[PDB]
Amino acid sequence: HFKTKLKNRRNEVNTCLCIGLDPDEDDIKNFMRNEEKNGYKNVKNNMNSNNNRIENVIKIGKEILLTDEENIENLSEEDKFFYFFNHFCFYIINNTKEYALIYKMNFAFYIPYGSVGINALKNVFDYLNSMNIPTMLDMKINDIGNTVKNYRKFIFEYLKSDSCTINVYMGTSMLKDICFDYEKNKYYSAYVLIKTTNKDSFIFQNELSINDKQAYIVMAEETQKMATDLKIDQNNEFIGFVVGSNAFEEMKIIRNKFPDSYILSPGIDLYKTLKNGYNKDYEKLLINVGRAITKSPNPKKSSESYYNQIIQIFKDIEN
Amino acid sequence: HFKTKLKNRRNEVNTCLCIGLDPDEDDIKNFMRNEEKNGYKNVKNNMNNNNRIENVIKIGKEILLTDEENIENLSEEDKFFYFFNHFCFYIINNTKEYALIYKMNFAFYIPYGSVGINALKNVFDYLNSMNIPTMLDMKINDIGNTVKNYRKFIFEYLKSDSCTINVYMGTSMLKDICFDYEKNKYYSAYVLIKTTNKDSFIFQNELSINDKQAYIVMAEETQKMATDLKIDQNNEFIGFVVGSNAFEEMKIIRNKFPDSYILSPGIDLYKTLKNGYNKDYEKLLINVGRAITKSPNPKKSSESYYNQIIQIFKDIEN
Numbered sequence: 001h002f003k004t005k006l007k008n009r010r011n012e013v014n015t016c017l018c019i020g021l022d023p024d025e026d027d028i029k030n031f032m033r034n035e036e037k038n039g040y041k042n043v044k045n046n047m048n049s050n051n052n053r054i055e056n057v058i059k060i061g062k063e064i065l066l067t068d069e070e071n072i073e074n075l076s077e078e079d080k081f082f083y084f085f086n087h088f089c090f091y092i093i094n095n096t097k098e099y100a101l102i103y104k105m106n107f108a109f110y111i112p113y114g115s116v117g118i119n120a121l122k123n124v125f126d127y128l129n130s131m132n133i134p135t136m137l138d139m140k141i142n143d144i145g146n147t148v149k150n151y152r153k154f155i156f157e158y159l160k161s162d163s164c165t166i167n168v169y170m171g172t173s174m175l176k177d178i179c180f181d182y183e184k185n186k187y188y189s190a191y192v193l194i195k196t197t198n199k200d201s202f203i204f205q206n207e208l209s210i211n212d213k214q215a216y217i218v219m220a221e222e223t224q225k226m227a228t229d230l231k232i233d234q235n236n237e238f239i240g241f242v243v244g245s246n247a248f249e250e251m252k253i254i255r256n257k258f259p260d261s262y263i264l265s266p267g268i269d270l271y272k273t274l275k276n277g278y279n280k281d282y283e284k285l286l287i288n289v290g291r292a293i294t295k296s297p298n299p300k301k302s303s304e305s306y307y308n309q310i311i312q313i314f315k316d317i318e319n
Numbered sequence: 320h321f322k323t324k325l326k327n328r329r330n331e332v333n334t335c336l337c338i339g340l341d342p343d344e345d346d347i348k349n350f351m352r353n354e355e356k357n358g359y360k361n362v363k364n365n366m367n368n369n370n371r372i373e374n375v376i377k378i379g380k381e382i383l384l385t386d387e388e389n390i391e392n393l394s395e396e397d398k399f400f401y402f403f404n405h406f407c408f409y410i411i412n413n414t415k416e417y418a419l420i421y422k423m424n425f426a427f428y429i430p431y432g433s434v435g436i437n438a439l440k441n442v443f444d445y446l447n448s449m450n451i452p453t454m455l456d457m458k459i460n461d462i463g464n465t466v467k468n469y470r471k472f473i474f475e476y477l478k479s480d481s482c483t484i485n486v487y488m489g490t491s492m493l494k495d496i497c498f499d500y501e502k503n504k505y506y507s508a509y510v511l512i513k514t515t516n517k518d519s520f521i522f523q524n525e526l527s528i529n530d531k532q533a534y535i536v537m538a539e540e541t542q543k544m545a546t547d548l549k550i551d552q553n554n555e556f557i558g559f560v561v562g563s564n565a566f567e568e569m570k571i572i573r574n575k576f577p578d579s580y581i582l583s584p585g586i587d588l589y590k591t592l593k594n595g596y597n598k599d600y601e602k603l604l605i606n607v608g609r610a611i612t613k614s615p616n617p618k619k620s621s622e623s624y625y626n627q628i629i630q631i632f633k634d635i636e637n
Contacts, residue, residue, distance in 0.1 A: 114510035115433035169487035200489035
């Protein structure tokens with residue numbers, strides 16, 4: 001169950017750092033040109049460090065990923081893209097996992113190439129799962145109840161993610177068909193969009209209200225109501241909240257109203273975010289860092305940097 | 320070009336019928352069992368549609384062209400791909416004479432990973448080869464720079480004419496879905512306004528700004544964005560999804576936005592068309608999915624809705 005898995009991981013890595021793995025065309029292009037020039041150092045690390053993890057865990061395109069160096073030149077453009085896409089992902093994971101509570105993969109980055117990116121996405125989940133590292137698919141899924149069961153299957157049965165993000169504007173009833181499977185008697189964790197990071201997020205989340213309660217608060221309340229009716233907490237899973245690292249006032253409000261809630265915070269001011277949303281159980285406030293790590297000349301060092309800033313902030317907060 | 324393409328299609332088929340193509344495991348199992356005991360009748364029709372599969376399909380073509388003798392040479396996974404694609408082709412072939420547009424809900428295609436996205440790509444390729452209007456119902460949402468990935472998947476990869484969008488995060492995302500600066504291209508879409516699910520009132524109606532319900536506010540903000548983007552000048556549109564069971568909201572939306580494109584899933588049919596009426600029929604799509612795709616005779620069932628709509632328009636238009 002995810003509450004225990006997340007707890008146990010937090011004890012092991014002693015952080016709330018959530019690493020965002022959102023590879024784009026630039027990243028893969030740059031990875032490919034760098035590898036061709038540094039004697040494939042990172043690809044060689046992925047293959048030879050590192051347990052022979054690829055050969056034991058990967059089920060899609062395994063032989064492409066294992067291609068001998070002389071033979072890379074001869075891959076089709078599609079197979080080459082698949083090669084460097086996967087290897088970039090494995091490189092980031094291998095270099096940063098020592099500092100990572102959880103990895104969050106945003107689905108948007110994986111779908112634009114059709115099947116090739118979804119195959120990569122599956123590989124990434126298989127790879128992380130082989131190390132029991134917590135995972136999340138950030139897909140902001142929504143549809144009517146019977147239809148959303150398809151996303152439940154994709155995310156929790158196919159990818160075997162620990163968690164996902166969900167947009168409940170249609171209604172909270174969808175939660176019963178994402179976070180619970182009656183036939184399997186299984187429960188799954190998720191984070192619902194409460195306050196997002198985009199500049200215009202006030203338009204509906206803040207400007208709309210009911211009896212002087214802003215929309216984001218009403219939506220958090222309705223979400224918790226559904227979570228309680230589902231009895232999800234009793235099953236050691238949770239339905240939490242996405243609250244942007246720039247939404248300091250909303251973070252304070254949500255944390256105070258729901259002191260035991262699990263929060264995901266994308267968008268990293270870091271000190272104010274952590275102070276306002278603080279929980280002694282660090283895993284209940286995930287701080288997502290993606291591009292600052294994945295686009296870094298040195299993602300290990302950079303992940304370390306965020307890891308140390310967080311320690312210092314908790315030192316300061318808990319003084 | 321979509322405003323023109325839809326108008327032209329409406330001129331050919333003379334209906335607002337939108338056919339939902341949402342194949343589930345039941346459908347594919349049933350189709351396979353039926354084909355194996357009717358002598359592959361529908362597969363035969365698919366492939367006889369003059370070599371359309373052979374000329375158009377670029378993914379798993381050899382598998383799809385497998386002779387019925389050799390379908391058991393197919394691994395269970397290839398068989399699944401085979402009947403999934405052929406089921407979709409069978410639906411389209413049997414119903415296209417009555418269809419203004421096909422709406423494919425992304426949810427039905429993703430749960431098998433690559434397999435279903437391959438089939439989805441095939442479905443769009445097939446429809447696009449006949450220039451038939453298409454929509455991907457995916458209810459997309461993210462931050463602007465991230466949503467560009469959805470724009471690429473939907474409008475560049477699949478080459479859909481349209482999609483559905485959830486703007487609860489903000490309307491700024493519309494600029495990165497419905498417009499591509501680098502290519503100078505515009506694309507059409509329908510934004511969620513009033514959904515069909517029983518509990519859609521919690522946020523869509525109960526939330527408000529003083530006297531104006533959320534769904535109205537969201538429709539206004541959407542139109543504001545579309546105007547800012549100059550989408551209409553470029554022969555595209557940003558429209559609204561309004562449930563066929565939401566008669567009251569449909570009336571308010573059509574009255575306030577008399578020239579808007581509306582998609583109505585759910586199908587009462589009379590009240591929907593009456594309340595949401597536009598003399599340009601394409602401006603109120605009536606989506607019918609399961610009632611057609613799960614019918615023992617999808618042609619007759621589609622024909623039935625086609626005729627029902629003809630009769631309603633007779634009644635409404637004096």
